[PDB]
Amino acid sequence: MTYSESDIAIVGMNCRYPGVHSVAAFETVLRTGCNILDPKVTPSNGHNHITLNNVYEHMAEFDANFFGYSRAEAEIMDPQQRVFLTCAWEMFEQSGYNPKQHDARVGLYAGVSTSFYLLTHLMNNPDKLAQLGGLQIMVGNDKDHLTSQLAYRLNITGPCVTVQASCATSLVAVHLACEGLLSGQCDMALAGGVTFRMEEQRSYESHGDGLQAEDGLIHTFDAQASGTVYSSGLGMVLLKRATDAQVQGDNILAVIKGSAINNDGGARSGYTVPGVDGQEAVMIEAHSLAEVTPQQIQYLELHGSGTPLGDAIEFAAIKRVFGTPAPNATPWRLGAVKPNVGHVEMASGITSLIKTVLSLTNRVFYPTLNFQRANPQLGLEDSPFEVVSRLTPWPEGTTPRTAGVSAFGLGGTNAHLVVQAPLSTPQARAQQMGPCVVVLSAKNHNALEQMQNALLAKLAAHPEIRLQDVAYTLRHGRFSAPVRKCVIAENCTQLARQLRDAPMVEATTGCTIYWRLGHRFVVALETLSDWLACSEVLSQAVGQLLEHFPLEPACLQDLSPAQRTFISQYALIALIDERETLNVVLCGDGDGGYAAAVLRGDCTLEQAWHRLNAGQPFDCSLMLDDAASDANRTALEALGQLWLAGVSLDWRWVDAAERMLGSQRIALPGTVFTPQRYWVEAVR
Amino acid sequence: MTYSESDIAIVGMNCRYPGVHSVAAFETVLRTGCNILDPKVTPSNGHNHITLNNVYEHMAEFDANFFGYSRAEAEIMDPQQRVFLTCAWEMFEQSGYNPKQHDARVGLYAGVSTSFYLLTHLMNNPDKLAQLGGLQIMVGNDKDHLTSQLAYRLNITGPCVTVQASCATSLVAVHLACEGLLSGQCDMALAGGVTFRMEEQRSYESHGDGLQAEDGLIHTFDAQASGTVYSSGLGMVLLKRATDAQVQGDNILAVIKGSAINNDGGARSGYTVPGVDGQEAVMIEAHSLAEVTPQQIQYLELHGSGTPLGDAIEFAAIKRVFGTPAPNATPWRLGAVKPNVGHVEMASGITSLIKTVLSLTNRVFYPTLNFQRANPQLGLEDSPFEVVSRLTPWPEGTTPRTAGVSAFGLGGTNAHLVVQAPLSTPQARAQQMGPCVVVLSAKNHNALEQMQNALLAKLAAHPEIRLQDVAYTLRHGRFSAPVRKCVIAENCTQLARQLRDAPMVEATTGCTIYWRLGHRFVVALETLSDWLACSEVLSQAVGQLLEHFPLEPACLQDLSPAQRTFISQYALIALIDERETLNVVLCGDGDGGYAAAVLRGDCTLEQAWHRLNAGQPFDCSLMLDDAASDANRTALEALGQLWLAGVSLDWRWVDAAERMLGSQRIALPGTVFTPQRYWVEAVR
Structure with missing residues (x-):
């Protein structure tokens, strides 16, 4: 069996959270069931003053130099935009795609919070506020640019759209991406979101409203749910048509079968209230487009805001869509990521999606935190549902491992995904020993050294990595920098001694x-x-x-x-x-x-x-x-x-001379940024 | 001949500019060739201090009451969002669609400038800055909400997406709308943009950079082009599948045949510079999708920024795409709207599109102002191109009247449209006299009176309006308010004396x-x-x-x-x-x-x-x-x-009893807002 024409493959992911600097690390948070926010509650004038670990410490850091920004440009540029860019470049490399050079059309679908950097920091430095030109301040902070910048720096000419839809933004982006793929407008697409809180936003005052948690804890679906808790976060994925990804040596992590986006319309008690009708609607639509009955979905990744009402509604809408399962069928598993890493205004959806993809690839349901006792009003007990509160292996059914992902934004804009495990890879891979062209490049020798050592380190760590892959990935998935090193090897072992003995060559044009x-x-x-x-x-x-x-x-x-x-x-x-x-x-x-x-x-x-x-x-x-x-x-x-x-080659030339069959894009070390702090302080 | 499957019909428009409060009025500006900015240049410290009429005076006004906003909510709510909403409701009514009730799925694709209201006004009222809750301040100003609000207030459940793409925003929106129509995600869609300048942004200082005009004049393509001139502005359109619009009694103003969006990528001298390659690319793509050769397009609505470089580039890209015409074919006509109403950061594209649609419907090329002498570097003279500087009738060719619309945003995100006159309407309309059910409703008698008088006024002004239409429009295109008046008439004349004699009835539930x-x-x-x-x-x-x-x-x-x-x-x-x-x-x-x-x-x-x-x-x-x-x-x-x-009816019931064939949605008076000022002042 092969992939469906409407099937979108996820071939890359990337995320950032406070103290979480890689997908791998995020996975660890999910596995170990960790709550990065580590809140601190102080009773305060009948209310609760809550301090969090909800600011992404490293936001200030950037390789302005590498990305061709003047220190000034960098200092006024919104951290969100910077880190997003850095992360994009990274993800592209990790997915085996040369960030700045693209065979196929690439789409950018992504969204960003308002620049509180601008609001709080920049706008309180009257000096740098004008000394560097208002227009550039706008270029540095207006959401619009998020994509446009990336499109510049990664030399992307596909559809380029900053999408905005409150909490749903990231998933709306994902959707519009799938759309742009299936429509044909692009051939590969980056979709995602980013929300950074400034230091000034670390704390918050709990009013008892039921919107923000009183205890700094997102008790999704739990009796003690008092509200949600906002955090910094960033997420993005790399998507392309499954059918293509299959034959284009991509590691298909998971497959979006179908997606949908809508709004609760007027079917709600007030602007900021969820609409059962709407959430119901979106889920239904998605499931329809993914051609799946609820019975064929095992897991649902909730919005799981932690707001009593929001949870209550969401679950209602779920019950409506799922109904009753086949007698003696296992219950539907429910999960939520927001307890782990907070609510990430823009990058919530994509976070949930990543959690899901990890859940799939690792074939586990990750624990949902702060869930000690189901909230009465859900009536979960009698329902054919259960919230996952323990790492539990994802059993195999007669149908594919398949989950649904919901992102329901304040203002009633909703998004839903059906995400499915990929086809099992029938790999009778008679890995052929043969000469492979391994190539490294950097901006300066010193970097190239580091890259070298990093790669060798990786290979040494993972002796199972095959050379065909490496050599391929290092050609297609990396930019030809000016300082270069090239080797022809027979195997990853041999390679070490070659790489080291081999010369570093600065292209003399x-x-x-x-x-x-x-x-x-x-x-x-x-x-x-x-x-x-x-x-x-x-x-x-x-x-x-x-x-x-x-x-x-x-x-x-x-x-x-x-x-x-x-x-x-x-x-x-x-x-x-x-x-x-x-x-x-x-x-x-x-x-x-x-x-x-x-x-x-x-x-x-x-x-x-x-x-x-x-x-x-x-x-x-x-x-x-x-x-x-x-x-x-x-x-x-x-x-x-x-x-x-220093000649420019079409790597296909090399590929054809190598004749390495079934070669694969793999996640190796890549570009070595040495970033500096670029930060404007607020003048008190 | 019938409409193509991929053909998107424009069935509604609406716009606002300083001192321009209706499409009709805008048309007048275009026809009379007026420059609403009325600049004033004062020599200032070796430079020029320029003052404009570039702020939309009425932004402060709103029927918060009507739309269910508390005065507080309204005061913190971004004018952009408010006026956008008001205008949406209006346009819906004017297109004969009941704003709050929708037979088909409705999509919202729209974008907005950063809220300078927030930045300049709100943020300088430390009181209301927190006294009304940060979250609500965000709900009031974060671009995200633009669509979400409309989706709430007009009870829209379709795709709901705040789209952002610098200057291209509005057209990118239009595109994504068409996309969502053709994809099937929605059945009718509103697409548009809005940019309001605060008073603090009225004047500007001319630095000689070549970005902003030295004389306060956008000399598009003219030798004196010194830069562009930014203004307030709002634009929106109502789109649906031509094939449907044809048979659903819509007045199809014009047809988008094809659209495309892209980015200049890395093919430019610096982030804020246009990319010939990219603009070329987008136009080509669009023309391809609209299945038209350049030869089949007569008019192009330029971006026409008025920046020497930008114009220069744009035109280059044009020359590349169009090439040489058929021997002795009339030259390609070039136009630009930005001289007339300024550059409207977000609502530029949609403005150009509207200008175009008007150009089509009125079968005229409207003058492009400030064009006395082609800029040398364009070499327009030798080219088969001609900037329109005089109202001149749009000649008829062997192929449909067809034009292209370009919106090229700072940051390199571009959009292009092919817009075509609609099929000529074979109207053998044997208008049948017969009984028609005419209905008016309002929130209170006093309003209903006004509505009555307005309507009668219209009918009296346009004796050619046929009753079938009226009666239909007043059913489908208006909301059933609580104070009601219903009449069965035989003709628009008779109607007056009935409406007047008829009673106003408050629904007793x-x-x-x-x-x-x-x-x-x-x-x-x-x-x-x-x-x-x-x-x-x-x-x-x-x-x-x-x-x-x-x-x-x-x-x-x-x-x-x-x-x-x-x-x-x-x-x-x-x-x-x-x-x-x-x-x-x-x-x-x-x-x-x-x-x-x-x-x-x-x-x-x-x-x-x-x-x-x-x-x-x-x-x-x-x-x-x-x-x-x-x-x-x-x-x-x-x-x-x-x-x-006060019973709720499905108007189809009435339609079927009337049996009025070929009835049509028409632009009549509608909801009567009485809006108050909602405004926060900056505390010095």
Whole structure:
């Protein structure tokens, strides 16, 4: 079985919370069932003064330098935007995608809280408030820019939309992303949200309203639910069409089957009140679009605000949508993330979604905290529902592991997802040992060193990581920085000693590329066919020589070694010259001379072709010759020394020369930022 | 020919600018070629101090009362949000749609500037800054709420998304709207933007940067272009699937054939610089999706910022996309709205779009101001392009009147539309005189009076308005307020004297509805079939009597008058009781008695049916009887007096009794707001 046409694959995630600096770490919070807010309640004038760990300490830090910001620009730029950017770049790398260069169209769908940095900090520094130009202050803080910045810095030209929808924002984004994928507007999309609280917002005063918790604890669905608790947080995911992700060497974490967004409309007691009708509606719609009955969903990731009324309503809407299960079917499992990491105004939804994805991949229901006793008004006990309060393994059913994710925003804008485990990967992967081109790059040697050591460290830690993957990932999923290092290895072990002994090369732009064409250079049918398959211009010119367009593997096999030399030789240098006319000198040997004369431009292709069939020869250094080493290998090294010399390659070239089948994008170490503090203080 | 599946019809518009309070008025500005900003330049310290008419005077005013806001809520609520809401309600009414009640799913796609009200006014009233609760201040000002509020107040449950994309916002919204229509997520959608400048933002200091005009004039594409000029402004449109709009009595103003949104990505000299590549790309994409060659577009509505560089780039991108026209083809016409009403940060796009739609409907190219002499670097002269600087009629070609609309936002987020004149309306409209049910409602008599007079005024002004339309519009396009007035008229003339003589009736909820069923009540086949067609429950119950499900017109025609009485009679009261079980007393006469006994619940339908075929009778006041007057008429009055008594009707009931064919939604007077000032002042 393969993925459904409407199936959106999650191929990347990233998140930040106070003291939680990686998805991996977040997972740990969920697993160990930790509450990062660590609240502190002080009775205060009949109310409760509550202090939290709800501010993302590191917000001030940024590699302004790396992202091309002046220190000033960085200081007025909203932390939210900065950290979001950093995180995007990271996630892209971790998902095996070169942040600044994109084969396919990329969409940006994301939202952000108001810039309390602006409101509290910037606006209380009358100096920097004007000395750096109001317009730029706006560029630094107006929500609109969140996406536009990322689109600049990651050179993204797809749909680019800052989406805003109170608490639902992140999931609304996710939805609009799926939409933009399925519509075709983009081919891969980043969707997410970010909400940072300033230090001034660490505390809060509890009024007894039932909106904010009296005890600083989100007692989702618990009898003691007194309200919610707001925190800093950031979340994002990388989505693409499952059908594509399957064959594009993506690690499909999970699949959004269907999504929906709506509003409670006027079916509520007042603007800021949830609407059973609406939540019901959205869930129904989503489940419909994901073509799933409630019975086929095992888990639901609640909004779980911790507000008595909100919880009460949400659950009502749930009961309505789910109804009764098949006799003796296990109850529906309910969970909530907000107890763990607080309510993250914008990045709530995506947080829940991430929690879910982790729940799926790890095949566990993670505990929902502060749940000591179901709230009477839910009547959960009699219901076929139960809140998860212990790490418990996600049992396997006759249908896929499947969960629903709800984000119900203040103001009544709602979003719902159906998320499903991915297809089990039938991996009879006869991992082929063979030469692989491993490449690292950085902005300076010192970084490259660190990258090197980090990678080696990873490989050493995970001996099961296979080279095909590494080599691939380090090509497609990383940007070609100016300081480079390239190695051809047979295995991750060997690699260490090579990498270390290998030289670091700063691209010296615009040198002479010298080409020695040897007698024989017979590269593999696959390689040549893939190479030619990279350019219409070639495929035609060759199609005419072979009297057979389009070109087909067999078609090439008929060619004599002596010919395939000429053709292979030509093809490569022609691809290079096409992508970038650089200073290319040539020099041929026997069967090489022919190609050499063509590429030089002494004659036309067919001219030499006929002359080669007639046997009428002609009279940074690279060579192309079986004699020296396996043609294919000679090609890899050839390309490598090119890249080192600072030529721009289409990695497909290398991929085709490697012929590594079933290679995979993997999460490796990546860009090494050294960020500084960029912060404006409020002048008292 | 009919509309394409992907064709989105614009069926409503609305806008506000300083001193421009209606679309109609805006049109006047465009026609008369007026520049509302009326700048004033004062030499100042080597620079120019410029004062404008760029603040929307009335922002402070609102019918908080009408929309259910406490004066506090209103005072902290962002003017942008308020005026937007008011305008939405208005536009809905003017497009013939009941703002608070929606047959189909409605989507909200809209964006808003940062709340300078918050920043400048609210935040300088330390009192009201906390005395009314931070959370509510956020609810009042955070962009997120723009849509959510509207969704509440207009009881909209569709997709609800605050979209943000700098200058492109409004058009990005429009796009996402079309998307949500075509995707099916909604059935009608409001898309728009709003940007209000506070008084503190009226003037500005000209630095010579080339970003803001030195003379307070947007010289789009003109040699003297020194920059742009920012203003207050609001815009919105009402969109739905053309194919539907065609048959749903909408006035299709124009059609979006295709749309696209993208970003300049990294193809620019710096974050705030336009990217030829990107603008090129977006236009191309759009034109592709609208399936049009440049040659099939006559007009382009420029971004026309008035910044030398921005204009220069835009035009380059245009040249690239359009190329050369067919020999001796008239040149492409270029226009820009920003000279007329300034640059409206968020509502620029939608403004341009409206200008375009007006350009189309009025079949004219409106003048682009401040254009005395093309800017050298454009090289417009040689180009097959021509900036429109005179009201000039839009000639007819062999292909439809078709234009492109560009919105290129700072930060590189771009949007492009292809907008086309609608299909010419084949209106063989044999306008049928006949009885029509005209209904007015308001919150209090005093309002109802005003509404009355307004309406009569309109009708008197436009004697060509046909009653079918009026009566329809006043049913579907208006909310049933508690103070009501209902009339059955034969023509708009007659109507006046009826409306005046008619009583105003305050719905007294839960009175007794008395039903007299007369011997005969044979309503038209159409009417009965439509009535039954309103409820599955009925269509089945009758389908069983007639042994023919689904029901077909002919099927009913076979029924004897004496039967059709019983069935018609039943059907109506059954529909009423279905929609709302009210206290319904009954009383029958001959053939009536049968229905009466059924509805009373003495027997089951078929029980009386068989008894009627056997001829075995039984033994707020309304009656149902040919004897009194044409059955159909009797039904209209019946329904009317119901509605007056304050019953909730499905207007389809009335529509079906009227049988007015080809009725149309028309722009009449509507809800009468009496708004107060809600404003927080800055405490110095």
